[PDB]
Amino acid sequence: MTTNYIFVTGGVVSSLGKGIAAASLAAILEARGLNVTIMKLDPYINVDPGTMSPIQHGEVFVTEDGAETDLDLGHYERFIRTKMSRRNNFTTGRIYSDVLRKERRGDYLGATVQVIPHITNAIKERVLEGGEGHDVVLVEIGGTVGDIESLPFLEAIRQMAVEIGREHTLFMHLTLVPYMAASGEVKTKPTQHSVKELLSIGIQPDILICRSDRAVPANERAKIALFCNVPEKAVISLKDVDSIYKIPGLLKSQGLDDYICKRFSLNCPEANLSEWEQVIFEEANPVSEVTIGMVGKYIELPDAYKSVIEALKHGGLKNRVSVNIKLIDSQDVETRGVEILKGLDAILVPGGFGYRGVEGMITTARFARENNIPYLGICLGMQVALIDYARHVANMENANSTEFVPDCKYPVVALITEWRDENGNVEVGTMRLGAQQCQLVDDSLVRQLYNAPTIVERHRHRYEVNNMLLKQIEDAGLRVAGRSGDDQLVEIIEVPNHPWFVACQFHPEFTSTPRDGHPLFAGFVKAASEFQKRQ
Amino acid sequence: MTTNYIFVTGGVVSSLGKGIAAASLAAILEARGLNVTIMKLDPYINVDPGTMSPIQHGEVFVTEDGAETDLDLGHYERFIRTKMSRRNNFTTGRIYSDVLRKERRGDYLGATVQVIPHITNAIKERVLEGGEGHDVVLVEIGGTVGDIESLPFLEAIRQMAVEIGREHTLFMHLTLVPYMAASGEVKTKPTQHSVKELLSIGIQPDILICRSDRAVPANERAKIALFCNVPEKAVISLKDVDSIYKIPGLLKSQGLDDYICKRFSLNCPEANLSEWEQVIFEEANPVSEVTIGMVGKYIELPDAYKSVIEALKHGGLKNRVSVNIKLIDSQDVETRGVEILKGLDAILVPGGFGYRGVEGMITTARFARENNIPYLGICLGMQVALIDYARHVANMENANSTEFVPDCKYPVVALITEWRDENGNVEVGTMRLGAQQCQLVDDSLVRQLYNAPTIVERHRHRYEVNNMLLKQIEDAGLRVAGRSGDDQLVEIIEVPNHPWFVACQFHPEFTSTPRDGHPLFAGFVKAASEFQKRQ
Amino acid sequence: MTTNYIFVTGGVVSSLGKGIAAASLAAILEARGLNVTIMKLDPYINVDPGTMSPIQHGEVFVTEDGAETDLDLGHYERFIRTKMSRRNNFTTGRIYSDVLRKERRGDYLGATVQVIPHITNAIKERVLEGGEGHDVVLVEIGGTVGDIESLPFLEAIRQMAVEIGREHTLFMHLTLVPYMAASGEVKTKPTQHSVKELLSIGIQPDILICRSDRAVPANERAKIALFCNVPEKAVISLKDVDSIYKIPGLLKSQGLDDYICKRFSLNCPEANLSEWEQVIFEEANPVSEVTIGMVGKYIELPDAYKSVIEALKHGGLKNRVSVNIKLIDSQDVETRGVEILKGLDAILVPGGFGYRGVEGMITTARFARENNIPYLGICLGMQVALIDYARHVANMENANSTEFVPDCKYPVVALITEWRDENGNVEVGTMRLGAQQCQLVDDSLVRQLYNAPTIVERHRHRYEVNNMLLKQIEDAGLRVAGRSGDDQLVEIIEVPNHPWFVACQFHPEFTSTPRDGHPLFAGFVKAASEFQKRQ
Ligand SMILES: Nc1ccn([C@@H]2O[C@H](COP(=O)(O)OP(=O)(O)OP(=O)(O)O)[C@@H](O)C2(F)F)c(=O)n1
Ligand SMILES: Nc1ccn([C@@H]2O[C@H](COP(=O)(O)OP(=O)(O)OP(=O)(O)O)[C@@H](O)C2(F)F)c(=O)n1
Ligand SMILES: Nc1ccn([C@@H]2O[C@H](COP(=O)(O)OP(=O)(O)OP(=O)(O)O)[C@@H](O)C2(F)F)c(=O)n1
Ligand code: NA
Ligand code: NA
Ligand code: NA
């Protein structure tokens, strides 16, 4: 049984929600019992997003195998239960890096190395590597058709369609159908022009996904069909929705999955979207409303905390609570004080690097601890929680991380190599990425929530809890809730004289989904609801 | 059984021989017992070529039904036995004229008349009119893909393909694969770029006909296939050939007809190209060689006399004579004299309008008559022969046509409505177009050549033989060999004291084919051979 | 005074002679006293041609500074006296390698690295780096407009034109104007379509260079001007020529350099092409004809020996001898013997790597030595000359290079590190690239020819003459003619019991020009003429 490919392209504009559309379609196909996966081809030159700023790119998503990937793989894992790996995301940078190394080494045997066939072959190889052994592979092409950056990807998939054959390949193209106030009509002209552009590259689209701020009526869909060599039933309306969880239903409603199953000769039962219907229901029917403050340094781009924002949303679903997420610049806490943290039912400090706004986060963790306001700290959120406690409870003056103040007396957070005590005494592979097992301390808040002794979560951090200064903070009342490895590194801390205070080193947001939620975020949003009642 | 359409387009350059290629492919399909026709879509604004100079776009071809058409319909009739009519040729001018007519009187009922759907509908309607009731319809699109003028034709046939279905429609695209001396290789890049241009208008070609001055090798055909979404077997080499009669064989040897019959699900036997093999054999195995002078006013563009040139070649085939056609400017006969008519084994004066170079043709007819050199006069060629005899034998000094000298004493050639005698006395559907019956005189040369009392030949002329001055020329020894209609108009004249001197009003070149030849031209070339032997 | 840029692009096909056209125009501009340079932007992914096979790419050209570059820089140095360096040639591979290293390091400070601005900025930087400090910079863009591979280069130079301003930038675009036999006309349609393609990328061409097998007449140039927004005087005909040395004259004849000087506001005297007129004259008026055999392993692509073929041509100019260059596969000498070396007035064995066909070259050097046939050996040509002599005169059985037979008893050629004697005894930065001074032995044939004690030539070789086995070959009659460095490496050898036998380690072909010739190649072709007389 041959692997089938759906090549997903975008026209007219970016910000179409190509990832969500691909993820939603994969959700439908998975709900028909098909083995489905998705991969993201990014046209940027970065070898991977490891070097990309949260404020410019958005969050670096981390897979089980510890790959640093586009945040779209977050969308993928939140819509299908197939696990993403390094094989599900690559950049132009990776491809050119691959080919350059093969070339300098001498693997091409004196050949002229060319965009075709050498760059295109490298792209095709990685697509087959990620795709083979599945029923359907959705291959999302980053960039916009008509731009320079995506042309090698478009040429590569054109070749793949011919080689594999059109019996097992489809081209799905997203376009913008914008509304004009003047005439009160949605416009098909950009779709007409975008399809000609895609054809000029050698690709006849099979399916058109028409993005608009409203439903694309039958007349406009018929016009698109007429001009684009596409049957009317293969022209799909995908309007702006109040919830992305509705998109699987909207696509199924227009028979998109039936068309795909027919084209690929797949006999599978009707999509059971009951789990998505349940999610849509939960979201539309909240009993309470809470305001949770996310206090961090990358707030000028919310996508910097994409998976965190979505994990809070999933916590809301499982408690039937509407979570009003307030983004509060941690630097504003330094400037204007803890008055901007007033009127919050809970507080979350997410991950980050660099000292800018960290003193604000330390002040925020203090305010949360002293006023019994529910707190969740992720990576840097655990660091500022340990610093706050060490500094203000265990009386370790100016206790900090070596990342921020390298020569500080009390480096409560530092690299395993840098570990020292207050007198400068020492003991007799630095970056941690991906899935690692963590042992939960018995009778701990997290042990209850996770409802198991051992959990698996994903790391992306360099700086650890200094084990040499740990005992002095433990004696001062702080509780180690979780540990991992032969080195017994601190994964989770708690403040037990508090309604809900948890802080973890790993990124729990990367394992949270709308359907299965997350124990930690469920507990956090519950505690936020309970706090809101007591006022 | 549904009618099948092959849309024949050209890329890179014009002058690819789109007509000869379509005609040659039609010849193969006809040899497999298929009911095949061809039609030409011309992007020029002329409502028809009736108002076009011969030196402009070539000869005006005339069908049986008296349609003035593109010379390509000459190629069609010389390659298939299916007769051409008005509905096998239309222009942009014709389409716009019909739509404007319908619009001005109010057929469109207050609608905005647009390129789509109104112009494209009109194009499709005329394609179905000429096509339906055949197995395979070849639709030649004039102009080059990428130009403005052919876009409405290309959009129209794109729509037809979708409507009729790809089960019964193919796109056959000719390109130039030019040779570069610098590198000693033929170049596929223009084909690559032309196919992207054709795709950008919404048409994926199914077959590529690669024109070059030599065979397009396997490597180049594979490269074209790789880049153009076309299977290797549908990439056809059409090199420059010494004889166009070989082209059906070249295309068949690459399985083009097999691919078409498979795609259209037509169960028909292998093509028997015996009739074309015979024509090729005749042409390659001549016994004698003759030089025939064609003395006219349009020699600067040979295609002005396309059908006449081919008729002479068909004459050669039937006699196993190799005909060297020497094009001689009739104005050079006026200036330099009969010196340039020496060394000719026969003389042909073809049709034309306007007085420029006519006196040279009259001088030429005289030279051919007085020196007993075989003479064939067509339309104007007959006028100048009558003028010659009237002026130099019947002693009617300054005898001319009213076309050239309206106020001449002896208008031996004039419109029926101008007919007057030498004293200015008179007697008591001006334009004659298409097939008309002609009665042949019992003791005439043509009666024995045609071997029938009545014949059918095609007219395109206004100015007739003046019947009022005819009997005076008849008494001077001129034979009337043929007449027609109620008004007994002179169709053929002969000089009986001469080896071979014939001149007709009609265009015998339009019914001459390479396979069936033509009685008159067969006779004329025989006389040219006989004259050559006697010298 | 601002540096002016002429961006030279190609359309329709490659193999237009973009390099020759750019080089020829630079020659004219240099002849007006302007400081002119040229650079080649190659779209291949190879970081440089160092790793490219001669049989696939052609020769690796070597500049003074020891850069391995496209053979086009050979054309540049043979048309202008400005010296080429690493700065005058770079690939897509170099640009992507630059950007990837900056990115991984962290030079982009967390930015998304994109084709625009990061790849385009890298291209612009290298163009400015090679261009600045000249009056006019010709920037040759490799690939064909309309292809994927050159788009980053085209976008980069589009930006440069806007930034620098159109007062100091011109776009010069080459196209093919092919001849069609059928109509007997050259076709402007590909030029029309190529200019639209270039405009679609954001570039309005200022100058059109029309390549054809004949002159492009005024009517066709006027048609190109009409459709392309280019004045008729900026549409240049560049027909196929029997000599590339004529091209400067043909371009000046059409005022190309006047237009450029006007557009860039350069007041400079009329181009003095006297040196080119002298070269054209010399070439057109040979007194003798010689047949020189070039016996090597890369003969299936003559461009593998591009600069060698041209150096022989320049030798012909300086002696007024027509050099008939016969390419003889050295492997055919192994198969069919020295019978295929019969009827040669001289023999040249050029550079190469690998053992394939080397035994044929050793046999060829023997035949040349024994029969007193003039011999020139370049790099591998010196190796096979030293091997032949050592093996057949000094009686060193199976004497070879360590490159070919690593464990041979007499490694007469080997790396400086590998150097051993016949008993395996040894003495108590391997690749040599670019200009190195060489000391010529007094009373040597080369000392006479070069007419100086010290010469500067360019190296590209790993394997040296083994100094430990040298004395035994010297005693056997062989003469060291040139040496270099502190290690006193053998640069040139001679056989003094021979009319003309020279072999050098360096590549003299890279310093040979049509105007100034080359002492060594002048001497070689002279000796070939003298040998031809004695028969
Ligand atoms: N390839 C094409 C397609 C169409 N048109 C012409 O496009 C014209 C209609 O222009 P509109 O109303 O702006 O476009 P719409 O298609 O209705 O798309 P929208 O949904 O954005 O309104 C017709 O005259 C035409 F003639 F149909 C054209 O000239 N060439
Ligand atoms: N769509 C395309 C197609 C090709 N190429 C690039 O085109 C380059 C080859 O250039 P050539 O030799 O002039 O083209 P050819 O295809 O061999 O066609 P011809 O038969 O006319 O010679 C490759 O580096 C490439 F990379 F393959 C490209 O960049 N984009
Ligand atoms: N952008 C354009 C340009 C031209 N044409 C149409 O192109 C037609 C002429 O077609 P040809 O004779 O093949 O082209 P040529 O320009 O003479 O170029 P060549 O030198 O290759 O012969 C006109 O009817 C037209 F109308 F002028 C067009 O439709 N759109
Ligand atoms: Na509209
Ligand atoms: Na090529
Ligand atoms: Na033309």
**Cβ–Cβ contacts within 10 Å for residue B277, how many?**
14
- Across the interface, whether the CB atoms of A204 and B200 are under 8 A apart is answered no
Catalytic residue list contains B68: no
Q: What are phi and psi of B229, to 5 degrees?
A: 60, 30
Tokens of A374: 């529910």
* DSSP track, C452-463: SSEEEEEEEESP
Examine the domain organization and report whether B192 and B333 are in the same domain.
no
B-chain residue closest to A193, CA distance: B200
Q: In testing the pocket of ligand 1, which one of A192, A199, A224, A237 has its CB within 8 Å of the most ligand atoms?
A: A192
Interchain CB contact of B431 with A (< 8 Å): no
Give CA–CA dist C507/C74, Å, rounded: 12
Partners of C53 on chain A (C-beta within 8 Å) are 109-111
The type of residue at A527 is A
Of C253, C285, C317, the domain-final residue: C285
In a shared domain, residues A379 and A462: yes
Per-residue b or e along A353-390, where b marks 16 or more CB atoms closer than 10 Å to that residue's CB:
beeebbbbbbbbbbbbbeeebbbbbbbbbbbbbbbbbb
d(C-alpha C201, C-alpha C427), whole Å: 62
d(CA C64, CA C84): 7
Ligand that comes closest to the CA of residue B114 = 1
- Is B339 catalytic? The answer is no
**Distance separating alpha carbons of residues A514 and A244, to the nearest angstrom:** 11
Instruction: Give yes or no for residue A188 CB within 6 A of ligand 1.
Output: yes
B14/C contact by beta carbon, under 8 A: yes
User: Quick check: C374 and C319 in contact, CB under 8 A?
Assistant: no
CA angle C10, C14, C18 (to 5 degrees): 55
In the numeric block, the tokens 């990439």 are attached to: B235
Residue type present at position B37? T
Q: Is the dihedral of CA B255, B261, B262, B263 positive or negative?
A: positive
Cβ–Cβ < 8 Å for B71, B59: yes
Q: Is C116 an 8 Å CB contact of chain A? A: yes
Contact by Cβ (8 Å): C345, C374: yes
Using alpha carbons, list the distances in angstroms from residue C356 to C359, C384, C405, C412, C417.
8, 13, 12, 18, 24
From atom 2 of ligand 3, which residue's Cα is the shortest distance away?
A: B147
Q: Residue B56 is encoded by which pair of tokens?
A: 């402009």
The residues with which A139 forms a beta bridge, in sequence order, are: A7, A39
Tell me if A302 sits within 8 A of A327, measured CB to CB: yes
Beta strands C346-349 and A432-440 are: unpaired
Q: How many CA atoms lie within 13 A of B480 on its CB side?
A: 18
Q: What is the DSSP letter of B300?
A: T
Q: For residue C422, give its domain range.
A: 286-535
* Kind and range of the H or E run holding B459: strand B454-461
Q: How many CA atoms lie within 13 A of A185 on its CB side?
A: 8
Experimental resolution (Å) = 2.2
Residue with tokens 């609570």: A321
Cβ atoms of B330 and B381 within 8 Å: the answer is no
Query: Which residue, chain included where needed, has tokens 């942009």?
Result: B92
Within this chain, do residues C95 and C230 fall inside the same structural domain, yes or no? yes
Instruction: Please count the residues of chain C.
Output: 535
Backbone angles phi, psi at A404, to 5 degrees: -100, -55
Per the CB < 8 A criterion, the answer to whether C5 and C170 are in contact is yes
Q: Are A39 and A87 in contact (CB under 8 A)?
A: yes
Identify whether residues C264 and C334 lie together within a single domain: no
**Positive or negative torsion for Cα B7, B11, B14, B16:** negative
Nearest to residue C156, comparing CAs of C115, C96, C216, C103?
A: C115
> Are C272 and C396 contained in the same domain?
no
| Residue where one domain finishes, among candidates B219, B252, B285 | B285
Quote the tokens at residue A284.
């539309």
Report which of A237, A267, A261 is spatially closest to residue A249, judged by C-alpha positions: A237
A chain contacts of residue C98, beta-carbon cutoff 8 Å: none
Using CB atoms, list chains with 3+ pairs below 8 Å to chain B. A, C
DSSP string, C337-401: -GGGG-S-SEEEE----SSTTHHHHHHHHHHHHHTT--EEEETHHHHHHHHHHHHHTS--TT-EE
In this complex, do C12 and B189 lie within 8 Å of one another by their Cβ atoms?
yes
Token pair 């936020």 is found at A528
A321-329 and A235-239 beta bridge pairing? unpaired
C-beta of residue B418 within 8 angstroms of C-beta of residue B464: no
Q: What is the DSSP string of C394-449?
A: S--TT-EETTT-TT-S-EEEE-TTT---TTS-------EEEEEEEEEPTT-HHHHH
In whole angstroms, give the CA distance from residue C222 to residue C203.
21
- The alpha helices in A78-202, defined as continuous H runs, are 92-105, 120-131, 151-164, 189-200
Place of tokens 């919404």: B202
Cβ neighbours of residue C58 closer than 8 Å, sequence gap 6 or more: C71, C301, C303, C304, C306
Backbone angles phi, psi at A468, to 5 degrees: -75, -25
Same domain as B375, residue B277 = no
The count of domains in chain C is 2
For residue B350, give how far its alpha carbon lies from the nearest alpha carbon of chain C (Å).
21
Q: What is the phi/psi pair of residue B180, to 5°?
A: -110, 115
Q: How far is CA A121 from CA A115, A152, B15, B148, C108, in A?
A: 9, 10, 38, 37, 29
Partners of A226 on chain B (C-beta within 8 Å) are 159
- The angle subtended at Cα A468 by Cα A395 and Cα A401, nearest 5°, is 65
Do residues C402 and C417 lie in contact, with contact meaning Cβ atoms separated by under 8 Å?
no
Tell me the CB-side half-sphere exposure of residue B413, using CA atoms within 13 A. 28
How far apart are the CA of C70 and the centre of ligand 2, in A?
Answer: 17
How many Cβ contacts (< 8 angstroms) between chains A and B?
A: 32
C269 and C311 together in one domain: no
Residues contacting residue C134 through CB under 8 Å, at least 6 positions apart: C3, C35, C36, C37, C82
Is the beta carbon of C179 within 6 A of some atom in ligand 3? no
DSSP reduced 3-state for A435: strand
C274 with C340, same domain: the answer is: no
* Interstrand relation of A400-401 and B4-10 (parallel, antiparallel or unpaired): unpaired
As given in the structure block, the two tokens for residue B200 are: 């950008």
**Of the residues C210, C228, C261, C379, which is catalytic?**
C379
Do residues B319 and B398 share a domain? Answer: yes
Q: Directed axis angle between helix A92-105 and helix A120-131, to 10°?
A: 120
| Alpha carbon of C189 to ligand 3 centroid (Å) | 7
Beta strands B479-484 and B432-440 are antiparallel
- Give me the catalytic one of A210, A379, A408, A504: A379
Which of A162, A188, A228 should we substitute to test contact with B (largest number of B Cβ atoms within 10 Å)?
Answer: A162
What is the rounded CA–CA span in Å between residue C42 and residue A448? 64
A125: amino acid identity, one letter: E
Give me the residues paired with residue C211 across strands: C176, C238
For residue C504, the one-letter residue type is: C
CATH of the domain at B144: 3.40.50.300
Quote the CA–CA distance of A249 and A255 in Å, as a whole number.
Answer: 10
Q: Which residues contact C512 (CB under 8 A, 6 or more apart)?
A: C78, C307, C310, C311, C314, C315, C518, C521
Beta carbons within 10 angstroms of residue C111's beta carbon:
17
Q: Name the E strands within B257-320.
A: 288-296
Domain closes at, from A285, A319, A347: A285
Q: Are A322 and A259 within one domain? A: no
Q: Is B226 close to ligand 1, i.e. is its CB under 6 Å away?
A: no
| Separation of alpha carbons A102 and A107, rounded Å | 5
CB atoms within 10 A of CB A103: 21
Question: B-chain residues within 8 Å CB-CB of C303?
Answer: none
Contacts of A196 in chain B (CB under 8 A): 200-202
C182 closest CA partner among B145, B316, B212 = B212
- Looking at residue A199, what DSSP letter applies? H
Alpha-carbon distances of B28 from A28, A218, A337, B246, B252, rounded to whole Å: 51, 45, 90, 11, 7
Paired residues of C440 in beta bridges: C482
Cis peptide before A117 (omega within 30 of 0): yes
C-alpha C216: how far from chain center: 29
CB A150 within 8 A of CB A8: no
Choose, out of A173, A229, A235, the residue to mutate when testing the contact with B (most B CBs < 10 Å): A229
Kindly list the distances between the CA atom of residue B111 and the CA atoms of B96, B101, B104, B108, B114, in Å, as whole numbers in the listed order. Answer: 16, 14, 12, 6, 9
Q: By the 8 A CB rule, do C352 and C326 touch?
A: no
Q: Which of C180, C183, C185, C187 to mutate to test the pocket of ligand 3 (most atoms within 8 A of CB)?
A: C187
Q: How far apart are CA C61 and CA C56, in angstroms?
A: 14
Question: Which CATH number fits the domain that encloses residue B384?
Answer: 3.40.50.880
Same domain, C277 and C414: no
Strand order across the beta sheet in which A235-239 lies: A89-91, A36-42, A136-141, A4-10, A169-176, A207-212, A235-239
Tokens for A133? 């052994």
Q: What angle do CA B524, B528, B531 make, to 5 degrees?
A: 135
Prior bond of A231 cis (ω within 30°) = no
Could you tell me if B270 and B402 lie in one domain?
no
Angle in degrees, CA C346, C350, C355, rounded to 5: 120
Q: Are A142 and A7 in contact (CB under 8 A)?
A: no
